Design an enzyme around this catalytic site. Structure first.
Site, PDB file in Angstrom:
ATOM      1  N   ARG A 275     -36.233  21.350   7.264  1.00 48.76           N
ATOM      2  CA  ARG A 275     -37.316  22.244   6.880  1.00 48.76           C
ATOM      3  C   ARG A 275     -38.628  21.479   6.957  1.00 48.76           C
ATOM      4  O   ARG A 275     -38.770  20.405   6.368  1.00 48.76           O
ATOM      5  CB  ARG A 275     -37.124  22.764   5.453  1.00 48.76           C
ATOM      6  CG  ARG A 275     -38.079  23.906   5.102  1.00 48.76           C
ATOM      7  CD  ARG A 275     -38.001  24.345   3.645  1.00 48.76           C
ATOM      8  NE  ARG A 275     -38.649  23.389   2.753  1.00 48.76           N
ATOM      9  CZ  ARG A 275     -39.496  23.719   1.784  1.00 48.76           C
ATOM     10  NH1 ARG A 275     -39.811  24.985   1.575  1.00 48.76           N
ATOM     11  NH2 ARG A 275     -40.032  22.776   1.027  1.00 48.76           N
TER      12      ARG A 275
ATOM     13  N   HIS B 134     -47.838  25.630   3.432  1.00 53.53           N
ATOM     14  CA  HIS B 134     -47.475  24.587   2.479  1.00 53.53           C
ATOM     15  C   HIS B 134     -48.737  23.906   1.931  1.00 53.53           C
ATOM     16  O   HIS B 134     -48.896  22.681   2.010  1.00 53.53           O
ATOM     17  CB  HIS B 134     -46.549  23.560   3.138  1.00 53.53           C
ATOM     18  CG  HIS B 134     -45.675  22.817   2.173  1.00 53.53           C
ATOM     19  ND1 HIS B 134     -46.174  21.938   1.234  1.00 53.53           N
ATOM     20  CD2 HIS B 134     -44.333  22.826   2.001  1.00 53.53           C
ATOM     21  CE1 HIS B 134     -45.176  21.441   0.526  1.00 53.53           C
ATOM     22  NE2 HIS B 134     -44.048  21.962   0.972  1.00 53.53           N
TER      23      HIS B 134
ATOM     24  N   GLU C 195     -44.221  27.547  -2.986  1.00 49.64           N
ATOM     25  CA  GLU C 195     -44.798  27.450  -4.324  1.00 49.64           C
ATOM     26  C   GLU C 195     -46.138  28.143  -4.520  1.00 49.64           C
ATOM     27  O   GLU C 195     -47.178  27.498  -4.607  1.00 49.64           O
ATOM     28  CB  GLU C 195     -44.914  25.979  -4.732  1.00 49.64           C
ATOM     29  CG  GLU C 195     -43.581  25.279  -4.629  1.00 49.64           C
ATOM     30  CD  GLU C 195     -43.576  23.904  -5.228  1.00 49.64           C
ATOM     31  OE1 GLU C 195     -44.584  23.500  -5.828  1.00 49.64           O
ATOM     32  OE2 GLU C 195     -42.547  23.228  -5.105  1.00 49.64           O
TER      33      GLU C 195
ATOM     34  N   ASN D  43     -37.368  25.318  -5.593  1.00 53.37           N
ATOM     35  CA  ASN D  43     -37.717  23.908  -5.670  1.00 53.37           C
ATOM     36  C   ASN D  43     -37.606  23.565  -7.144  1.00 53.37           C
ATOM     37  O   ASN D  43     -38.311  24.138  -7.968  1.00 53.37           O
ATOM     38  CB  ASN D  43     -39.156  23.674  -5.203  1.00 53.37           C
ATOM     39  CG  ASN D  43     -39.320  23.822  -3.702  1.00 53.37           C
ATOM     40  OD1 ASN D  43     -38.361  24.132  -2.984  1.00 53.37           O
ATOM     41  ND2 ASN D  43     -40.538  23.599  -3.214  1.00 53.37           N
TER      42      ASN D  43
ATOM     43  N   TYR E 242     -37.207  20.323 -10.153  1.00 57.91           N
ATOM     44  CA  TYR E 242     -37.382  18.896 -10.382  1.00 57.91           C
ATOM     45  C   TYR E 242     -37.066  18.454 -11.794  1.00 57.91           C
ATOM     46  O   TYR E 242     -36.335  17.486 -12.006  1.00 57.91           O
ATOM     47  CB  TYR E 242     -38.815  18.492 -10.061  1.00 57.91           C
ATOM     48  CG  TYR E 242     -39.169  18.664  -8.609  1.00 57.91           C
ATOM     49  CD1 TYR E 242     -38.769  17.725  -7.658  1.00 57.91           C
ATOM     50  CD2 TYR E 242     -39.901  19.775  -8.176  1.00 57.91           C
ATOM     51  CE1 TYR E 242     -39.090  17.886  -6.308  1.00 57.91           C
ATOM     52  CE2 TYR E 242     -40.226  19.947  -6.827  1.00 57.91           C
ATOM     53  CZ  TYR E 242     -39.815  18.998  -5.903  1.00 57.91           C
ATOM     54  OH  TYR E 242     -40.113  19.171  -4.578  1.00 57.91           O
TER      55      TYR E 242
ATOM     56  N   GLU F 104     -36.095  22.316  -1.966  1.00 55.56           N
ATOM     57  CA  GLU F 104     -36.618  21.026  -2.419  1.00 55.56           C
ATOM     58  C   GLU F 104     -36.008  20.540  -3.734  1.00 55.56           C
ATOM     59  O   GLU F 104     -36.001  21.255  -4.733  1.00 55.56           O
ATOM     60  CB  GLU F 104     -38.145  21.054  -2.584  1.00 55.56           C
ATOM     61  CG  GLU F 104     -38.961  21.309  -1.318  1.00 55.56           C
ATOM     62  CD  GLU F 104     -40.446  21.078  -1.539  1.00 55.56           C
ATOM     63  OE1 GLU F 104     -41.276  21.453  -0.679  1.00 55.56           O
ATOM     64  OE2 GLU F 104     -40.791  20.502  -2.586  1.00 55.56           O
TER      65      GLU F 104
HETATM   66  O1  LIG Z   1     -46.421  15.652  -6.177  1.00 46.82           O
HETATM   67  C1  LIG Z   1     -44.979  15.362  -6.163  1.00 46.82           C
HETATM   68  C2  LIG Z   1     -44.155  16.670  -5.957  1.00 46.82           C
HETATM   69  O2  LIG Z   1     -44.855  17.688  -6.710  1.00 46.82           O
HETATM   70  C3  LIG Z   1     -44.271  19.043  -6.930  1.00 46.82           C
HETATM   71  S1  LIG Z   1     -44.981  20.435  -7.816  1.00 46.82           S
HETATM   72  C4  LIG Z   1     -45.228  19.758  -9.504  1.00 46.82           C
HETATM   73  C5  LIG Z   1     -46.745  19.779 -10.050  1.00 46.82           C
HETATM   74  O3  LIG Z   1     -47.680  18.824  -9.378  1.00 46.82           O
HETATM   75  C6  LIG Z   1     -46.832  19.270 -11.562  1.00 46.82           C
HETATM   76  O4  LIG Z   1     -48.217  19.281 -12.031  1.00 46.82           O
HETATM   77  C7  LIG Z   1     -45.924  20.159 -12.493  1.00 46.82           C
HETATM   78  O5  LIG Z   1     -45.935  19.681 -13.905  1.00 46.82           O
HETATM   79  O6  LIG Z   1     -44.523  20.143 -11.942  1.00 46.82           O
HETATM   80  C8  LIG Z   1     -44.335  20.635 -10.518  1.00 46.82           C
HETATM   81  C9  LIG Z   1     -42.749  20.520 -10.299  1.00 46.82           C
HETATM   82  O7  LIG Z   1     -42.005  20.077 -11.469  1.00 46.82           O
HETATM   83  C10 LIG Z   1     -43.836  19.690  -5.535  1.00 46.82           C
HETATM   84  O8  LIG Z   1     -42.926  20.717  -5.759  1.00 46.82           O
HETATM   85  C11 LIG Z   1     -43.174  18.605  -4.571  1.00 46.82           C
HETATM   86  O9  LIG Z   1     -43.037  19.182  -3.276  1.00 46.82           O
HETATM   87  C12 LIG Z   1     -44.012  17.266  -4.482  1.00 46.82           C
HETATM   88  O10 LIG Z   1     -43.382  16.387  -3.614  1.00 46.82           O
END
Ligand SMILES: OC[C@H]1O[C@@H](S[C@H]2[C@H](O)[C@@H](O)[C@H](O)O[C@@H]2CO)[C@H](O)[C@@H](O)[C@@H]1O
Length: 445
Positions: A76, A119, A164, A293, A295, A353
């Protein structure tokens, strides 16, 4: 205690155009909003910009080959709007050629592409017209998305529309944390409505052009837990959940915005005057799959401060990444379950992601990122339990094939499974990448 995944399961890797390409002022490309944003003092760590980055603009054949060599069937990536529409209604052929070639290389290695239309790298010339706060921007998107589908489409198996909407709208216009960097809730929510419409736009162009590739949007989502049994904290948590998840997921499946959030955003929604007859209908197009996505999770408590939500995030110093992001795989399983219950109810879910940023140290040509590692494996067990229990997870894309410009973090953070030496630009697979190769080989672990 082995984790085997469906035979049909989709194993991939993903990137972002501004985050890896470089060649910012090469081949007709005009400045994106991030090229500007990154110059504003204090906005990006170290003052870093997307200049050069991984220079994937020149190293793509090696990169894709490196993927094949790494056992990946799916890839992707995203198209930089700036390389395609460097100005109003022009259409840079040199930009399309770059992607076309990228596709030649991809198919040549026997990989299956997934093209992400937007993106976050909105052409600056568009932000000058008002960017996402202007409904007129949506037609500009239509123009861009049409050319992409006409020029390819026959070779694109998967269409990822917007990546996003939350970040591009709330962070880009609301908190000022992402490009273009405005701090105005009225514009954030307006921008959030216009970007969601673009998903519907591209969805309409998709069916109109009669394309066969699957299509869907990607929403970043986070599980939310209340900090305590206190009422206001539970209230706070509800508000956070509606802030990131429900505000974007609701319109996509239910054709409406969360009533409570609408109530809470009071005067900022201005009577929902930016909505027009048909908009919500246009938006409510789940498509063929839901891209997610994930995290980390959020632990919320309430405050009575001057911020929009009046919510405070508890900082769980517990297992965390180099970004201070807590590692709670249980939450991922909990989010996936909740998403099937509400919203998707059956529709195929795709993790476009998932990954982590740990401190990397290169030792004898090897990166023992055991950490990144304990992160991907653990969350995959989460994805395994969701399946097995009936979940519709059909694919997973480890986020960041290469270390890249990590937006506001700049290069201070590394999300790749392939280590990039910025002084020399050479690629060196990390231990996690090799583990992933052996993992996809046994289609499990
Ligand atoms: O920048 C590293 C990574 O970022 C995320 S989105 C991220 C926002 O920047 C943060 O302010 C908030 O608290 O959380 C979200 C996700 O938990 C993005 O998805 C990713 O592609 C990028 O590599």
């Amino acid at each position: 205690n082995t984790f085997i995944f469906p035979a049909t399961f989709m194993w991939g890797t993903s990137t972002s155009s501004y985050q890896i390409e470089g060649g910012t002022d090469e081949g007709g490309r005009t400045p994106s909003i991030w090229d500007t944003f990154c110059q504003i003092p204090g906005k990006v760590i170290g003052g870093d910009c997307g200049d050069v980055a991984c220079d994937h603009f020149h190293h793509f054949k090696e990169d894709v080959q490196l993927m094949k060599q790494l056992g990946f069937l799916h890839y992707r990536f995203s198209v930089a709007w700036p390389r395609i529409m460097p100005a109003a209604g022009i259409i840079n052929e040199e930009g399309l050629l770059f992607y076309e070639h990228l596709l030649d290389e991809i198919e040549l290695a026997g990989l299956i592409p997934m093209l992400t239309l937007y993106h976050w790298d909105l052409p600056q010339w568009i932000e000058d017209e008002g960017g996402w706060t202007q409904r007129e921007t949506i037609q500009h998107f239509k123009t861009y998305a049409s050319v992409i589908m006409d020029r390819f489409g026959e070779r694109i198996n998967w269409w990822n529309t917007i990546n996003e909407p939350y970040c591009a709208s709330i962070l880009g216009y609301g908190t000022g944390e992402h490009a273009p960097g405005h701090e105005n809730w009225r514009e954030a929510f307006t921008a959030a409505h216009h970007i969601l419409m673009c998903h519907g736009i591209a969805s309409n162009l998709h069916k109109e052009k009669g394309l066969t590739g699957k299509i869907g949007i990607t929403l970043n989502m986070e599980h939310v837990d209340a900090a305590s049994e206190r009422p206001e904290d539970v209230a706070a948590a509800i508000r956070r959940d509606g802030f990131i998840n429900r505000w974007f997921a609701e319109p996509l499946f239910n054709g409406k915005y969360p009533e409570d959030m609408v109530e809470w955003y009071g005067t900022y929604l201005n009577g929902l005057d930016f909505v027009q007859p048909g908009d919500m209908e246009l938006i409510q197009q789940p498509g063929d799959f839901l891209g997610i996505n994930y995290y980390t999770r959020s632990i919320i408590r309430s405050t009575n401060d001057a911020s929009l939500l009046q919510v405070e995030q508890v900082h769980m110093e517990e297992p965390v990444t180099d970004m201070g992001w807590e590692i709670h795989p249980e939450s991922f399983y909990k989010l996936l379950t909740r998403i099937e219950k509400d919203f998707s109810k059956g529709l195929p879910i795709l993790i476009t992601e998932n990954g982590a940023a740990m401190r990397d140290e290169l030792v004898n040509g090897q990166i023992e990122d055991t950490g990144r590692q304990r992160y991907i494996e653990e969350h995959l067990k989460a994805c395994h339990r969701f399946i097995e229990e009936g979940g519709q997870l059909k694919g997973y894309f480890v986020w960041s094939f290469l270390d890249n410009f990590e937006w506001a973090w700049g290069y201070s953070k590394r999300f790749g499974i392939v280590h990039i030496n910025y002084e020399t630009q050479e690629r060196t697979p990390k231990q996690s990448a090799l583990w992933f190769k052996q993992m996809m080989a046994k289609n499990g672990f």
